[PDB]
């Protein structure tokens, strides 16, 4: 009666879904009772302090357990053969063979090998001792308590922001580009040049002697005079040893390209010139928008004035600004679209260009860090369309949006969905049809009859980037071209030595197994958008239900009438895509892992023979690489893989429990509970006990969510168990 | 009044029902009056023994007796598990006398019986002097355990140890 | 009362707290409930900097045996990390009594026995205050390049005015 303090319509609910919907729409601030728009923005703003204070408490937790239970000071000296340590184990359910099988890495008690790879990130930003890691933990624990107290104070009625403070899109975007992006990256080059550059050269720059160590031997004199190439005079050599001064070099902003020879990481010096360069650009781009000083650009005159003539884009972008500034789901949907793509861009650019020292030698770290930021990118990208579909219901105004590009989206909305449905159907026909054709040719003993289309359009790009394995001799494989000859002292010889090395992940050599799987990724990208863009466009109505906007975003159905309307809502159009999302990111991570297993084992032909047909995906990647995983515990004994063996069956269990909420639906279960209510109310001596919230079955929309969560958690825990234990089992 | 710190208010349940509302309840643990009857005696009885405990050792640290950490495991007569059969069952009779004194009538401390107030003690300014001596006696006992855990010497001579060096010789170890 | 004879921005141009000088180009003198806090924080950032500057150029004619960056940690009576909870109590104990009511320097823990200075002596303490804060940031930038000593930049600039300046050190 009291727990949904936000929804009194749930407080009058005598059933047990009062508990379930007190949890799930507690952060749906736009539908709480008595919520106003000034009250809306203040709870969102304090909650962002709540997310920030969790992140810094989380990161200070990583700094603490590494400093206390980890072997970072032992891993510094030998960063190849010593395995990293996440946090020690105290499980009193263990047995004695399960204590000694988890003692590894040279430690005392049982430990977990950290596959998150925060050692490689910390080792290259200057962390060398555990005493440097406790200080970072106590620092972020202070900073996390600052953001806890800030979210409390910015709710207090003296310090509550005005409503016009939030809608100032000029001043925020002027401060976050210049200060939060520019000055922060300017300060991070300050951490690189002062601390992280000379720490690799074997020179301790701590808080005690950073005001005594010059970063450069003639420091601040080229910056004030002009000869900025003096900062790139004697760089880290080709025989540098990371962490020592053996062949050290003295440059602070070098522009080499390619990799360090030992670590096979990016150079620290061009990472300093990188974050310096975009710091200059973000500060310069942070002086664009008209806030309070008479100069700058108004957002209300850039959108509306870019209307092309002859009716190409309707009324142009006219009137969008009041539908971006006032709407939050439009702002959230753009942000999840941007962050979700530059989360993949993090993942796509860290296996090929590993930025931290002795990464892409630790293989399980590389496997986890790619697969993590792909599913993190996968969930964020489908939420961009989810909160894009909430925009068309809760925030869209057709009278405000007469004829702009946003309404022309809803105007030709069937042309969008039918052309996505053609591309998704063409790809699924002709990618599966080629694999089945290849599988039959493997089954009939004749591999020569396969369809093996060479990836010409991507090998043309790799040869244009400088990969002379294919011999297109086009631009950078062409030695007499222009772009090869405009950069032989600038940035090319490091980059061209780094591609033509066959044993890094920088522009891997590709064959027809990679033709087929990128089209399968293209299938999975176009079909996941087909489900989601249909969920955005048909959120306001279809011919089956022309008033879908009157019910809201997340409703069960519209009854059995009109032929039956199971899964008609835009929520139910969003949730189907999460299956096709996890499929798609499952396809990008199967292909990433198995091309990297065959690269790191050395049998690079074992992929290209077997990736052309789907049995080789099964009997050479799933069957073959799960040999030591499932042997984590057996009646002979157990080893260090048993925690990943147990999770691998734990993941199959949550997955299949997800089908129970997906195949069985609600009304089989509500009748079953009605027998349990009877058998409770008629049982002697249990009639002493009676419930408060009446037991009812989980609602239709809830059964979607609970089943998708069991589907997705069991999906993630299964593959992460297979990813960590197949990599680290043989490595 | 100056409760515990300037500026701050005493919370609404500290209305001087117990004498001396000193405003010190940051966890709001004086709201329930059924519990507040117990927490009065919890502030008494944790100091009723600890007053005589701390004077009883500060009399007898450096006179003729060993450390109270080793006074228990000293070789006495008729080993103390048999004396625990005395020293639990006899004091349980005292708690059995006082069990009808917690709840029904006569809140403990200020009862003043004839052999227990033979001189006729009195009203205010003599209730606070019994009150104030009980606070820092409780603060003594969690000092003396921590004074002996950090410095293995005698707690009398720790006073001379702090007078030998107020700067370096501190609690700061 | 102009920073330059071009403009006089605020609605707080007439309303003063005996510390007015007429300069606010960014907009932090316009919320009327907070100038009771802006002017006091400008005062207290000055008053804690006045005692600083007296004890920075003070040991220039006086003792050279203390250094500057080591002056925060020498062999004191207590250890330097051990004398800190004396600082957490005693400094705060007068601070809270300064905070009481904030009634425009209410004489609660800083009673002045008298001396009140209702005319321009209040503005002169502001101008001494708004120049003592520039004094401390002078003492902790040009020294803070680990080049000049407690204070030897003025004694250098009296020797080499057109020589030793900002763009002429360019060394360690």
């Amino acid at each position: 009666k009291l727990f949904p303090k936000f929804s009194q319509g749930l407080a009058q609910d005598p059933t047990t879904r009062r508990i379930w919907y007190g949890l799930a729409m507690a952060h749906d601030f736009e539908s709480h009772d008595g919520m106003t728009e000034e009250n809306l923005y203040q709870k969102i703003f304090a909650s962002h302090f709540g997310q920030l204070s969790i992140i810094f408490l989380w990161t200070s937790g990583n700094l603490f357990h590494v400093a206390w239970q980890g072997n970072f000071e032992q891993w510094v000296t030998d960063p190849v053969h010593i395995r990293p340590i996440a946090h020690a184990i105290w499980d009193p359910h263990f047995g004695q063979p399960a204590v000694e099988a988890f003692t590894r890495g040279g430690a005392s008690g049982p430990v977990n090998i950290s596959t998150s790879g925060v050692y490689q990130w910390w080792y290259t930003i200057g962390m060398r001792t555990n005493q440097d890691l406790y200080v970072g933990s106590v620092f972020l624990a202070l900073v996390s308590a600052i953001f806890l107290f800030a979210g409390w104070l910015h709710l207090q009625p003296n310090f509550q922001p005005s409503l016009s403070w939030f809608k100032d899109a000029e001043s925020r975007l002027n401060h976050h580009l210049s200060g939060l992006f520019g000055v922060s990256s300017l300060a991070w080059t300050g951490h690189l040049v002062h601390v992280a550059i000379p720490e690799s050269r074997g020179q301790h720059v701590g808080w005690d002697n950073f005001l005594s160590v010059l970063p450069h031997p003639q420091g601040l004199t080229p910056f004030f005079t002009g000869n900025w190439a003096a900062y790139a005079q004697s760089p880290d050599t080709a025989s540098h040893v990371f962490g020592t001064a053996q062949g050290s070099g003295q440059a602070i902003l070098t522009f080499l390209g390619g990799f360090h020879p030992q670590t096979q990481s990016l150079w620290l010096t061009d990472m300093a010139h990188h974050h310096l360069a975009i710091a200059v650009i973000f500060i310069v781009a942070g002086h664009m928008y008209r806030t309070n000083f008479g100069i700058g650009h108004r957002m209300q005159a850039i959108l509306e004035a870019h209307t092309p003539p002859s009716g190409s884009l309707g009324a142009g972008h006219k009137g969008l600004f009041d539908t971006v500034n006032n709407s939050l789901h439009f702002q959230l949907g753009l942000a999840l679209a941007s962050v979700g793509t530059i989360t993949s861009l993090v993942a796509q650019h860290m296996y090929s260009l590993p930025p931290y020292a002795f990464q892409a030698i630790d293989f399980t770290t590389q496997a986890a860090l790619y697969t993590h930021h792909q599913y993190i990118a996968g969930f964020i990208m489908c939420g961009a369309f989810a909160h894009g579909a909430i925009f068309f219901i809760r925030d869209y105004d057709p009278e405000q949006n007469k004829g702009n590009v946003l309404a022309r989206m809803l105007d030709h909305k069937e042309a969008l969905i039918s052309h996505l449905s053609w591309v998704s159907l063409f790809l699924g026909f002709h990618t599966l049809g080629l694999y089945v054709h290849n599988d039959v040719m493997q089954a009939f003993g004749t591999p020569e009859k396969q369809i093996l289309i060479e990836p010409v359009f991507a090998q043309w790009i790799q040869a244009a980037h400088g990969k002379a394995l294919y011999g297109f001799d086009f631009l950078l494989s062409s030695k007499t071209s222009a772009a090869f000859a405009n950069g032989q002292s600038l940035w090319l010889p490091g980059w061209l030595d780094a591609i033509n090395n066959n044993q890094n992940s920088l522009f891997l050599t590709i064959g027809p197994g990679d033709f087929l799987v990128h089209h399968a990724i293209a299938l999975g990208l176009h079909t996941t958008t087909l489900i989601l863009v249909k969920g955005a466009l048909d959120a306001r109505g279809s011919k089956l239900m022309p008033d879908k906007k009157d019910f809201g975003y997340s409703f069960p159905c519209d009854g059995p009438g009109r032929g039956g309307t199971c899964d008609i809502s835009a929520y139910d159009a969003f949730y189907l895509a999460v299956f096709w999302m996890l499929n798609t990111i499952g396809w990008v991570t199967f292909y990433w892992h198995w091309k990297h297993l065959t690269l790191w084992q050395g049998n690079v032909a074992q992929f290209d023979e077997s990736s052309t047909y789907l049995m080789g995906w099964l009997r050479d990647y799933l069957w073959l690489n799960s040999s030591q995983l499932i042997n984590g515990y057996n009646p002979f004994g157990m080893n260090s893989l048993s925690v990943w063996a147990w999770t691998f069956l734990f993941g199959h269990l949550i997955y299949a429990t997800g089908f129970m909420f997906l195949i069985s639906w609600r009304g089989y279960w509500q009748e079953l509970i009605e027998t349990l209510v009877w058998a409770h109310e008629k049982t002697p001596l249990a009639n002493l006990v009676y419930w408060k919230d009446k037991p009812v079955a989980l609602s239709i929309v809830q059964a979607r969510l609970v089943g998708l969560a069991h589907f997705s958690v069991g999906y993630i825990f299964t593959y992460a168990a297979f990813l960590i234990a197949s990599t680290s089992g043989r490595f | 009044r100056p409760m515990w710190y300037p500026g701050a208010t005493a919370p609404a349940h500290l209305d001087g029902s117990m004498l001396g509302d000193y405003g010190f309840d940051p966890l709001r643990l004086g709201v329930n009056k059924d519990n507040l009857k117990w927490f009065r005696e919890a502030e008494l009885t944790n100091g009723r023994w600890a007053m005589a405990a701390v004077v009883g050792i500060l009399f007898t640290d450096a006179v003729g007796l060993p450390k109270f950490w080793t006074a228990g495991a000293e070789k006495y007569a008729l080993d103390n598990q048999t004396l625990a059969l005395i020293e639990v069952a006899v004091f349980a009779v005292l708690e059995g006398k006082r069990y009808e004194i917690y709840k029904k009538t006569g809140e403990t401390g200020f009862l003043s019986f004839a052999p227990f107030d033979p001189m006729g003690m009195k009203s205010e300014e003599m209730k606070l002097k019994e009150l104030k001596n009980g606070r820092l006696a409780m603060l003594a006992f969690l000092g003396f355990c921590s004074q002996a855990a950090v410095y293995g010497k005698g707690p009398i001579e720790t006073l001379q140890l702090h007078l030998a060096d107020p700067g370096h010789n501190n609690i700061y170890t | 009362p102009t920073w330059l004879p071009g403009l006089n921005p605020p609605a707080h141009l007439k309303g003063a707290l005996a510390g007015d000088n007429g300069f606010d180009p960014l907009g932090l003198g316009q919320d009327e409930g907070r100038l009771k806090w802006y002017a006091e924080a400008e005062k207290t950032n000055g008053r804690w900097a006045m005692m600083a500057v007296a004890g920075i150029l003070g040991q220039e004619l006086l003792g050279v045996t203390p250094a500057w960056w080591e002056a925060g940690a020498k062999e004191y009576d207590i250890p330097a990390q051990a004398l800190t909870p004396i600082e957490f109590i005693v400094m705060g104990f007068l601070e809270i009594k300064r905070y009481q009511g904030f009634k425009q320097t209410g004489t609660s823990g800083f009673i002045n026995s008298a001396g009140m200075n209702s005319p321009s002596m209040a503005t002169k303490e502001v101008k001494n205050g708004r120049l003592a804060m520039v004094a401390f940031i002078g003492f902790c930038v040009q020294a803070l390049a680990t080049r000049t000593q407690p204070i030897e930049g003025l004694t250098a600039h009296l020797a080499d005015p057109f020589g030793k300046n900002i763009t002429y050190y360019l060394t360690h």
Binding site: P157 | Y5, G7 | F88, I89, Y99
Partner: peptide, 26 residues
Amino acid sequence: AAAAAAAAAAAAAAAAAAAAAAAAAA
């Protein structure tokens, strides 16, 4: 317990300022 008691004696003055924050905001 040097940095333990020094942080605790710092947390005493931090809690006393928190008693100033818990009143001056409302």
